[PDB]
Amino acid sequence: ESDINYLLKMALEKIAFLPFGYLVDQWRWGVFSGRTPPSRYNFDWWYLRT
Amino acid sequence: QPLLKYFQPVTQWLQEQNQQNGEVLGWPEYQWHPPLPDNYPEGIDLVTDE
Ligand SMILES: *[C@@H]1O[C@H](CO)[C@@H](O[C@@H]2O[C@H](CO)[C@@H](O)[C@H](O)[C@H]2NC(C)=O)[C@H](O)[C@H]1NC(C)=O
């Protein structure tokens, strides 16, 4: 029981972050390459977030 | 380029008309969705033509 408590404590910061890190650079790659023009910054951002 | 050259007169007229009407090109507010018509499932056979 203590091990599950500790593992859920750890997974709230080491697993909830994995979508974020990939999302951040993926968006910036799209912006740099030209696939996200300045008229689609928020559209693509929130598409990646969801 | 040939496609844009072919449609040059219509696109010039459209640009002039949009600038005169003061429209914003593109669709900001990408989240907007039209509201459901009142009593939609059962009020479909009503004439609303001008
Ligand atoms: C984007 O949405 C924002 C927030 O809803 C809009 O700002 C509001 O615009 C309405 C309509 O003019 C105003 O009544 C509100 O007072 C505005 N709120 C604020 C905090 O400024 C904004 O106009 C929208 N932008 C575009 C380009 O559609």
PDB file of C-alpha atoms and ligand atoms in Angstrom:
ATOM      1  CA  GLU A   1       0.000   0.000   0.000  1.00  0.00           C
ATOM      2  CA  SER A   2       2.829   2.412   0.796  1.00  0.00           C
ATOM      3  CA  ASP A   3       4.492   1.518  -2.509  1.00  0.00           C
ATOM      4  CA  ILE A   4       1.317   2.334  -4.443  1.00  0.00           C
ATOM      5  CA  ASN A   5       0.965   5.607  -2.528  1.00  0.00           C
ATOM      6  CA  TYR A   6       4.540   6.553  -3.415  1.00  0.00           C
ATOM      7  CA  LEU A   7       4.201   5.487  -7.052  1.00  0.00           C
ATOM      8  CA  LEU A   8       1.033   7.524  -7.535  1.00  0.00           C
ATOM      9  CA  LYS A   9       2.754  10.471  -5.872  1.00  0.00           C
ATOM     10  CA  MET A  10       5.608  10.127  -8.364  1.00  0.00           C
ATOM     11  CA  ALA A  11       3.411   9.489 -11.419  1.00  0.00           C
ATOM     12  CA  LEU A  12       1.546  12.762 -10.908  1.00  0.00           C
ATOM     13  CA  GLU A  13       4.663  14.708 -11.929  1.00  0.00           C
ATOM     14  CA  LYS A  14       6.659  12.278 -14.098  1.00  0.00           C
ATOM     15  CA  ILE A  15       3.752  10.963 -16.195  1.00  0.00           C
ATOM     16  CA  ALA A  16       1.454  13.990 -16.327  1.00  0.00           C
ATOM     17  CA  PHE A  17       4.384  15.894 -17.863  1.00  0.00           C
ATOM     18  CA  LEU A  18       5.196  13.555 -20.755  1.00  0.00           C
ATOM     19  CA  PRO A  19       2.365  14.873 -22.989  1.00  0.00           C
ATOM     20  CA  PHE A  20       3.446  18.473 -22.233  1.00  0.00           C
ATOM     21  CA  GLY A  21       7.160  18.242 -23.181  1.00  0.00           C
ATOM     22  CA  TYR A  22       6.471  16.548 -26.555  1.00  0.00           C
ATOM     23  CA  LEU A  23       3.544  18.983 -27.142  1.00  0.00           C
ATOM     24  CA  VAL A  24       5.685  22.129 -26.526  1.00  0.00           C
ATOM     25  CA  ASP A  25       8.508  21.283 -28.992  1.00  0.00           C
ATOM     26  CA  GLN A  26       6.062  19.730 -31.530  1.00  0.00           C
ATOM     27  CA  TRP A  27       4.110  23.043 -31.658  1.00  0.00           C
ATOM     28  CA  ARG A  28       7.335  25.058 -31.984  1.00  0.00           C
ATOM     29  CA  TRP A  29       8.513  22.764 -34.788  1.00  0.00           C
ATOM     30  CA  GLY A  30       5.269  23.430 -36.625  1.00  0.00           C
ATOM     31  CA  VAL A  31       5.637  27.173 -36.092  1.00  0.00           C
ATOM     32  CA  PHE A  32       9.239  27.254 -37.298  1.00  0.00           C
ATOM     33  CA  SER A  33       8.669  25.068 -40.362  1.00  0.00           C
ATOM     34  CA  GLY A  34       5.788  27.260 -41.550  1.00  0.00           C
ATOM     35  CA  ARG A  35       2.909  24.827 -40.995  1.00  0.00           C
ATOM     36  CA  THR A  36       1.443  27.178 -38.342  1.00  0.00           C
ATOM     37  CA  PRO A  37       1.237  30.692 -39.784  1.00  0.00           C
ATOM     38  CA  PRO A  38       0.638  33.564 -37.339  1.00  0.00           C
ATOM     39  CA  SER A  39      -3.099  33.141 -37.986  1.00  0.00           C
ATOM     40  CA  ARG A  40      -3.068  29.630 -36.489  1.00  0.00           C
ATOM     41  CA  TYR A  41      -0.901  29.909 -33.361  1.00  0.00           C
ATOM     42  CA  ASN A  42      -3.724  29.385 -30.877  1.00  0.00           C
ATOM     43  CA  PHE A  43      -5.706  27.005 -33.080  1.00  0.00           C
ATOM     44  CA  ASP A  44      -2.804  24.576 -33.355  1.00  0.00           C
ATOM     45  CA  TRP A  45      -1.750  25.146 -29.746  1.00  0.00           C
ATOM     46  CA  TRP A  46      -5.117  24.121 -28.353  1.00  0.00           C
ATOM     47  CA  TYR A  47      -5.439  21.283 -30.855  1.00  0.00           C
ATOM     48  CA  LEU A  48      -2.198  19.862 -29.462  1.00  0.00           C
ATOM     49  CA  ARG A  49      -3.286  20.516 -25.875  1.00  0.00           C
ATOM     50  CA  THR A  50      -6.541  18.603 -26.308  1.00  0.00           C
TER      51      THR A  50
ATOM     52  CA  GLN B   1       0.704  31.038 -60.310  1.00  0.00           C
ATOM     53  CA  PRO B   2      -1.318  30.257 -63.483  1.00  0.00           C
ATOM     54  CA  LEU B   3      -4.373  29.568 -61.317  1.00  0.00           C
ATOM     55  CA  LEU B   4      -4.046  32.953 -59.616  1.00  0.00           C
ATOM     56  CA  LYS B   5      -3.411  34.650 -62.964  1.00  0.00           C
ATOM     57  CA  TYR B   6      -6.576  33.137 -64.446  1.00  0.00           C
ATOM     58  CA  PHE B   7      -8.736  34.319 -61.520  1.00  0.00           C
ATOM     59  CA  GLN B   8      -7.159  37.784 -61.385  1.00  0.00           C
ATOM     60  CA  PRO B   9     -10.298  39.844 -62.220  1.00  0.00           C
ATOM     61  CA  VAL B  10     -12.620  38.015 -59.822  1.00  0.00           C
ATOM     62  CA  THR B  11     -10.031  38.109 -57.048  1.00  0.00           C
ATOM     63  CA  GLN B  12      -9.426  41.836 -57.558  1.00  0.00           C
ATOM     64  CA  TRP B  13     -13.170  42.465 -57.404  1.00  0.00           C
ATOM     65  CA  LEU B  14     -13.472  40.276 -54.297  1.00  0.00           C
ATOM     66  CA  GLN B  15     -10.614  42.066 -52.543  1.00  0.00           C
ATOM     67  CA  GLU B  16     -12.160  45.441 -53.350  1.00  0.00           C
ATOM     68  CA  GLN B  17     -15.593  44.337 -52.118  1.00  0.00           C
ATOM     69  CA  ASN B  18     -14.181  42.866 -48.895  1.00  0.00           C
ATOM     70  CA  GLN B  19     -12.121  45.985 -48.176  1.00  0.00           C
ATOM     71  CA  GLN B  20     -15.166  48.174 -48.843  1.00  0.00           C
ATOM     72  CA  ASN B  21     -17.316  46.019 -46.549  1.00  0.00           C
ATOM     73  CA  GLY B  22     -14.535  45.941 -43.947  1.00  0.00           C
ATOM     74  CA  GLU B  23     -14.447  42.161 -43.523  1.00  0.00           C
ATOM     75  CA  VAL B  24     -11.716  40.215 -41.752  1.00  0.00           C
ATOM     76  CA  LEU B  25     -10.154  37.535 -43.921  1.00  0.00           C
ATOM     77  CA  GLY B  26     -10.008  34.154 -42.265  1.00  0.00           C
ATOM     78  CA  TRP B  27     -11.938  32.851 -39.296  1.00  0.00           C
ATOM     79  CA  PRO B  28     -10.682  33.856 -35.858  1.00  0.00           C
ATOM     80  CA  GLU B  29     -12.904  32.526 -33.061  1.00  0.00           C
ATOM     81  CA  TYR B  30     -12.290  29.004 -34.326  1.00  0.00           C
ATOM     82  CA  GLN B  31     -14.250  27.675 -31.328  1.00  0.00           C
ATOM     83  CA  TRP B  32     -17.576  29.206 -32.331  1.00  0.00           C
ATOM     84  CA  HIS B  33     -20.450  26.817 -33.072  1.00  0.00           C
ATOM     85  CA  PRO B  34     -23.942  27.850 -34.198  1.00  0.00           C
ATOM     86  CA  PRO B  35     -26.705  27.405 -31.621  1.00  0.00           C
ATOM     87  CA  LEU B  36     -29.328  24.721 -32.020  1.00  0.00           C
ATOM     88  CA  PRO B  37     -32.623  26.022 -33.458  1.00  0.00           C
ATOM     89  CA  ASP B  38     -35.512  26.171 -31.013  1.00  0.00           C
ATOM     90  CA  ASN B  39     -37.585  22.974 -30.936  1.00  0.00           C
ATOM     91  CA  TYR B  40     -35.205  21.665 -33.579  1.00  0.00           C
ATOM     92  CA  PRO B  41     -36.160  17.954 -33.819  1.00  0.00           C
ATOM     93  CA  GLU B  42     -39.862  18.714 -34.424  1.00  0.00           C
ATOM     94  CA  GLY B  43     -40.018  22.167 -36.035  1.00  0.00           C
ATOM     95  CA  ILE B  44     -38.391  21.373 -39.359  1.00  0.00           C
ATOM     96  CA  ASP B  45     -41.344  21.795 -41.761  1.00  0.00           C
ATOM     97  CA  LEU B  46     -41.705  25.565 -41.300  1.00  0.00           C
ATOM     98  CA  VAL B  47     -41.221  28.029 -44.147  1.00  0.00           C
ATOM     99  CA  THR B  48     -38.653  30.709 -43.279  1.00  0.00           C
ATOM    100  CA  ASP B  49     -37.856  31.975 -46.796  1.00  0.00           C
ATOM    101  CA  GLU B  50     -38.069  35.720 -47.384  1.00  0.00           C
TER     102      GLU B  50
HETATM  103  C1  LIG C   1     -11.593  37.064 -29.026  1.00  0.00           C
HETATM  104  O1  LIG C   1     -12.333  36.813 -27.860  1.00  0.00           O
HETATM  105  C2  LIG C   1     -12.183  37.840 -26.910  1.00  0.00           C
HETATM  106  C3  LIG C   1     -12.711  37.354 -25.578  1.00  0.00           C
HETATM  107  O2  LIG C   1     -14.054  36.964 -25.716  1.00  0.00           O
HETATM  108  C4  LIG C   1     -12.877  39.076 -27.476  1.00  0.00           C
HETATM  109  O3  LIG C   1     -12.789  40.169 -26.594  1.00  0.00           O
HETATM  110  C5  LIG C   1     -14.130  40.580 -26.258  1.00  0.00           C
HETATM  111  O4  LIG C   1     -14.804  41.059 -27.398  1.00  0.00           O
HETATM  112  C6  LIG C   1     -16.155  41.403 -27.171  1.00  0.00           C
HETATM  113  C7  LIG C   1     -16.772  41.762 -28.502  1.00  0.00           C
HETATM  114  O5  LIG C   1     -16.228  42.984 -28.944  1.00  0.00           O
HETATM  115  C8  LIG C   1     -16.220  42.542 -26.150  1.00  0.00           C
HETATM  116  O6  LIG C   1     -17.548  42.841 -25.791  1.00  0.00           O
HETATM  117  C9  LIG C   1     -15.489  42.130 -24.880  1.00  0.00           C
HETATM  118  O7  LIG C   1     -15.406  43.181 -23.956  1.00  0.00           O
HETATM  119  C10 LIG C   1     -14.069  41.708 -25.223  1.00  0.00           C
HETATM  120  N1  LIG C   1     -13.372  41.308 -24.035  1.00  0.00           N
HETATM  121  C11 LIG C   1     -12.134  41.719 -23.714  1.00  0.00           C
HETATM  122  C12 LIG C   1     -11.603  41.169 -22.413  1.00  0.00           C
HETATM  123  O8  LIG C   1     -11.473  42.472 -24.413  1.00  0.00           O
HETATM  124  C13 LIG C   1     -12.192  39.465 -28.783  1.00  0.00           C
HETATM  125  O9  LIG C   1     -12.856  40.514 -29.432  1.00  0.00           O
HETATM  126  C14 LIG C   1     -12.141  38.289 -29.752  1.00  0.00           C
HETATM  127  N2  LIG C   1     -11.283  38.579 -30.869  1.00  0.00           N
HETATM  128  C15 LIG C   1     -11.530  38.266 -32.153  1.00  0.00           C
HETATM  129  C16 LIG C   1     -10.466  38.671 -33.138  1.00  0.00           C
HETATM  130  O10 LIG C   1     -12.536  37.698 -32.523  1.00  0.00           O
END
